């Protein structure tokens, strides 16, 4: 929308999706929350106004978060991309898109918000 | 000093109020003004201003480009954040070095992060 | 687990203030009143994810030394210095990729500095 | 295109010659001019210019600040390197975003590195 | 020893040109004509300090894949892409902290890109 | 001087000092070449026009290169600092000054020149 910044948030588990979602809405973002990579890509391809993408690396089934980010960057080459991972962050070195941030658990609400805001601000 | 003061200049009162409250909740003192003319007057008065957040365009001249120049003449290291509903094309030829430009809409968190990062990088 | 910040400042009023700022933002904080206690904490094998330290304390060693100890343990340790007096000592004494905050600074500035340095580890 | 072309503007012929030869040895084509007026004329003519290296001050107006603005109006991503024998105080309020300012003296290697890094960072 | 750059480009005239540029600057160069040969080199355990690769080759795999293999072996591997066609594919395909050079570029640009990425390893 | 950029170069061994020296003079720099940290510090303290410092970490005797850089930064807080080391570069993480570059052997002439020029250019 014209009034708000929309973040596509893609996370599997109920506890975390709502945790990340409320963190982002408290900071002033609109959140489109989805529970798979496939659903995230569908949304990206739908023509919906998406200003940044916060995505898990692994979902229950492919496509993974690496692929979500590639689709986002095809639509918008400057798209803010934050990956959220449990364990292996070293895969980012070979799979992450340029100028993305990966956050590996544990991380704080402040870290998530700073990452998202910094990347949106860097758009120029 | 005892405080960190942000000069905030925007001709949309709703935006001015919203940004003022977000910045004050974040720990900043805010001098909120409605025109580039008043921002420049605040700067030229000699008030202690630690960062400037300005719209690029107002109803009347001077514009935000000029506000940032006066600020930088006073303090060459001044944190400068531009607010716009257009205009990064204009920023490319008119913006001062090391400034941030935020295109509307942006969240409270974005403004806070921009201001804070520039203040933290100072020297 | 959690993200823990070691915070070292010899003024109780400031220590409490910086501590509450950081806990509100989601960090656990180990708040200590000297550089010596900070170094003791760092060497104990306690899980520390970032260090926010004053430069000058009542007792030696100074915060410049706290940072060196921290970086010996973890070469990528986020380091934020707090200062009120000589911030230009940082140019000759600070560790690489560190941030120095000169008083006065806001809660937001502290949160941003800590958060951006943690995020940069990738 | 087939070449990478740098517009180089300086009113000191010895410097102009020296920078021209360093840049050409490094692989660039150089359009070397002696004033801001001629640099702007080159820009407004529609010649393919991939980077601008300009002195801040010439004998007559327009100055290097204005040369960089015209360049950035044409191409908002234009690599801009300023050459000065003073003036970073002036750069703080007059320079365009993402530009480099080199204070005299600087080596051939510095100019090459500045131009190359800005070209490499483009997009 | 030496600093070795793996260079992959399927045009012999360009490969020779980029190779001479890099050897004149002090690098050893392993010059290969395909992404497949580059990946074979990377997986062999040969000491490679940086990779400069075309995006499109005659045979598969492409340079985007060369970079991923390089980064699997070394997560901090300097990566420079060379392209003439779609450089905007980099936004969605490039690895983090890589540089893409779009033709035309000068010898200086190539040397600067490789050198600055090597230097950033610290 | 007004005409040239002066680099203080501090290196122990004859082969390398002359190698680094000629690399820097070919690139257009004036080089003040010294063979110890003590001599480098003396020069820095003499009031000589020094625009950047390229220094070894270890000399035959203390003061070391870490200390050379601290002295340089006391004189000029913006001084370009490039360290040159054989083996242990990880000591830079705890001992290097902010915004310095460390080059660990082997490195090329291009790398040295790029490091020096980039840091001089970043002075603003």
Short mmCIF file of N, CA, C and O in Angstrom, two decimals, chain D residues 65-114:
data_model
loop_
_atom_site.label_atom_id
_atom_site.label_comp_id
_atom_site.label_asym_id
_atom_site.label_seq_id
_atom_site.Cartn_x
_atom_site.Cartn_y
_atom_site.Cartn_z
N UNK D 65 31.44 21.28 -8.87
CA UNK D 65 30.17 20.93 -8.24
C UNK D 65 29.04 20.87 -9.27
O UNK D 65 28.28 19.91 -9.30
N UNK D 66 28.99 21.88 -10.14
CA UNK D 66 28.00 21.94 -11.20
C UNK D 66 28.21 20.89 -12.29
O UNK D 66 27.24 20.35 -12.83
N UNK D 67 29.47 20.59 -12.60
CA UNK D 67 29.80 19.56 -13.58
C UNK D 67 29.24 18.21 -13.11
O UNK D 67 28.61 17.49 -13.89
N UNK D 68 29.43 17.91 -11.83
CA UNK D 68 28.93 16.64 -11.27
C UNK D 68 27.40 16.56 -11.25
O UNK D 68 26.84 15.49 -11.46
N UNK D 69 26.73 17.69 -11.02
CA UNK D 69 25.27 17.73 -11.07
C UNK D 69 24.72 17.45 -12.45
O UNK D 69 23.77 16.69 -12.57
N UNK D 70 25.33 18.04 -13.48
CA UNK D 70 24.89 17.81 -14.86
C UNK D 70 25.10 16.34 -15.23
O UNK D 70 24.22 15.71 -15.80
N UNK D 71 26.26 15.80 -14.85
CA UNK D 71 26.57 14.40 -15.09
C UNK D 71 25.55 13.47 -14.45
O UNK D 71 25.07 12.53 -15.09
N UNK D 72 25.21 13.75 -13.19
CA UNK D 72 24.24 12.96 -12.43
C UNK D 72 22.79 13.12 -12.91
O UNK D 72 21.99 12.19 -12.79
N UNK D 73 22.46 14.28 -13.46
CA UNK D 73 21.16 14.50 -14.10
C UNK D 73 21.01 13.60 -15.32
O UNK D 73 19.94 13.05 -15.57
N UNK D 74 22.10 13.44 -16.07
CA UNK D 74 22.15 12.61 -17.26
C UNK D 74 22.12 11.14 -16.86
O UNK D 74 21.33 10.36 -17.39
N UNK D 75 22.98 10.77 -15.91
CA UNK D 75 23.08 9.40 -15.43
C UNK D 75 23.24 9.40 -13.90
O UNK D 75 24.31 9.72 -13.39
N UNK D 76 22.17 9.00 -13.18
CA UNK D 76 22.13 9.10 -11.72
C UNK D 76 23.13 8.19 -11.02
O UNK D 76 23.40 8.36 -9.82
N UNK D 77 23.69 7.25 -11.77
CA UNK D 77 24.69 6.31 -11.27
C UNK D 77 26.12 6.65 -11.67
O UNK D 77 27.03 5.88 -11.41
N UNK D 78 26.31 7.82 -12.29
CA UNK D 78 27.63 8.21 -12.82
C UNK D 78 28.70 8.19 -11.73
O UNK D 78 28.54 8.82 -10.69
N UNK D 79 29.79 7.44 -11.96
CA UNK D 79 30.97 7.60 -11.09
C UNK D 79 31.51 9.04 -11.13
O UNK D 79 31.73 9.58 -12.21
N UNK D 80 31.67 9.64 -9.95
CA UNK D 80 32.17 11.01 -9.80
C UNK D 80 33.36 11.04 -8.85
O UNK D 80 33.25 10.64 -7.68
N UNK D 81 34.50 11.50 -9.36
CA UNK D 81 35.68 11.76 -8.54
C UNK D 81 36.00 13.25 -8.64
O UNK D 81 36.19 13.75 -9.73
N UNK D 82 36.06 13.92 -7.49
CA UNK D 82 36.45 15.33 -7.43
C UNK D 82 37.94 15.45 -7.15
O UNK D 82 38.49 14.66 -6.36
N UNK D 83 38.56 16.44 -7.78
CA UNK D 83 39.97 16.77 -7.56
C UNK D 83 40.03 18.14 -6.90
O UNK D 83 39.40 19.09 -7.38
N UNK D 84 40.78 18.24 -5.83
CA UNK D 84 40.91 19.52 -5.18
C UNK D 84 42.25 19.75 -4.56
O UNK D 84 42.90 18.86 -4.14
N UNK D 85 42.62 21.01 -4.48
CA UNK D 85 43.73 21.40 -3.66
C UNK D 85 43.34 22.02 -2.34
O UNK D 85 44.20 22.54 -1.66
N UNK D 86 42.06 21.97 -1.98
CA UNK D 86 41.60 22.33 -0.64
C UNK D 86 40.78 21.28 0.11
O UNK D 86 41.19 20.84 1.17
N UNK D 87 39.64 20.85 -0.45
CA UNK D 87 38.33 21.41 -0.14
C UNK D 87 37.30 20.44 0.39
O UNK D 87 36.16 20.50 -0.01
N UNK D 88 37.66 19.57 1.30
CA UNK D 88 36.68 18.59 1.76
C UNK D 88 35.62 19.23 2.62
O UNK D 88 34.51 18.73 2.76
N UNK D 89 35.95 20.36 3.21
CA UNK D 89 34.92 21.11 3.83
C UNK D 89 33.88 21.45 2.81
O UNK D 89 32.71 21.32 3.09
N UNK D 90 34.26 21.87 1.62
CA UNK D 90 33.25 22.17 0.64
C UNK D 90 32.49 20.96 0.13
O UNK D 90 31.35 21.07 -0.16
N UNK D 91 33.15 19.84 0.00
CA UNK D 91 32.57 18.55 -0.45
C UNK D 91 31.40 18.08 0.41
O UNK D 91 30.40 17.56 -0.11
N UNK D 92 31.53 18.29 1.71
CA UNK D 92 30.52 17.93 2.70
C UNK D 92 29.14 18.53 2.41
O UNK D 92 28.11 17.90 2.66
N UNK D 93 29.12 19.76 1.88
CA UNK D 93 27.84 20.40 1.52
C UNK D 93 27.53 20.46 0.03
O UNK D 93 26.38 20.68 -0.34
N UNK D 94 28.54 20.26 -0.82
CA UNK D 94 28.36 20.39 -2.28
C UNK D 94 28.48 19.12 -3.11
O UNK D 94 27.94 19.04 -4.20
N UNK D 95 29.21 18.12 -2.59
CA UNK D 95 29.40 16.86 -3.31
C UNK D 95 28.13 16.04 -3.47
O UNK D 95 27.21 16.14 -2.67
N UNK D 96 28.08 15.23 -4.53
CA UNK D 96 26.94 14.37 -4.81
C UNK D 96 27.14 13.04 -4.05
O UNK D 96 28.27 12.73 -3.66
N UNK D 97 26.05 12.29 -3.80
CA UNK D 97 26.20 11.02 -3.06
C UNK D 97 27.10 10.01 -3.77
O UNK D 97 27.12 9.97 -5.01
N UNK D 98 27.85 9.22 -2.98
CA UNK D 98 28.71 8.12 -3.48
C UNK D 98 29.94 8.57 -4.29
O UNK D 98 30.65 7.75 -4.88
N UNK D 99 30.20 9.87 -4.30
CA UNK D 99 31.38 10.39 -4.98
C UNK D 99 32.62 10.20 -4.11
O UNK D 99 32.52 10.02 -2.90
N UNK D 100 33.79 10.25 -4.74
CA UNK D 100 35.07 10.28 -4.05
C UNK D 100 35.71 11.67 -4.23
O UNK D 100 35.61 12.26 -5.31
N UNK D 101 36.30 12.21 -3.18
CA UNK D 101 37.12 13.42 -3.32
C UNK D 101 38.60 13.13 -3.03
O UNK D 101 38.94 12.58 -1.98
N UNK D 102 39.45 13.46 -3.99
CA UNK D 102 40.90 13.30 -3.84
C UNK D 102 41.53 14.67 -3.62
O UNK D 102 41.33 15.58 -4.43
N UNK D 103 42.27 14.79 -2.53
CA UNK D 103 43.01 16.01 -2.23
C UNK D 103 44.41 15.90 -2.80
O UNK D 103 45.11 14.90 -2.59
N UNK D 104 44.81 16.93 -3.55
CA UNK D 104 46.16 17.01 -4.11
C UNK D 104 47.19 17.15 -2.97
O UNK D 104 46.94 17.89 -2.02
N UNK D 105 48.32 16.42 -3.05
CA UNK D 105 48.69 15.47 -4.10
C UNK D 105 48.12 14.05 -3.90
O UNK D 105 47.87 13.62 -2.77
N UNK D 106 47.91 13.37 -5.01
CA UNK D 106 47.52 11.98 -5.03
C UNK D 106 48.24 11.34 -6.20
O UNK D 106 48.58 12.01 -7.17
N UNK D 107 48.48 10.04 -6.11
CA UNK D 107 49.22 9.35 -7.13
C UNK D 107 48.30 8.88 -8.25
O UNK D 107 47.07 8.91 -8.12
N UNK D 108 48.93 8.45 -9.33
CA UNK D 108 48.26 7.81 -10.46
C UNK D 108 47.45 6.63 -9.98
O UNK D 108 46.29 6.48 -10.34
N UNK D 109 48.06 5.81 -9.13
CA UNK D 109 47.42 4.63 -8.58
C UNK D 109 46.13 4.95 -7.82
O UNK D 109 45.16 4.20 -7.92
N UNK D 110 46.12 6.06 -7.08
CA UNK D 110 44.93 6.49 -6.35
C UNK D 110 43.78 6.80 -7.30
O UNK D 110 42.66 6.39 -7.06
N UNK D 111 44.08 7.52 -8.38
CA UNK D 111 43.04 7.92 -9.32
C UNK D 111 42.47 6.69 -10.01
O UNK D 111 41.26 6.54 -10.09
N UNK D 112 43.36 5.79 -10.43
CA UNK D 112 42.97 4.54 -11.07
C UNK D 112 42.07 3.72 -10.16
O UNK D 112 41.01 3.24 -10.59
N UNK D 113 42.49 3.55 -8.90
CA UNK D 113 41.71 2.80 -7.91
C UNK D 113 40.34 3.43 -7.66
O UNK D 113 39.34 2.74 -7.65
N UNK D 114 40.29 4.76 -7.50
CA UNK D 114 39.03 5.46 -7.31
C UNK D 114 38.06 5.23 -8.46
O UNK D 114 36.92 4.83 -8.23
#
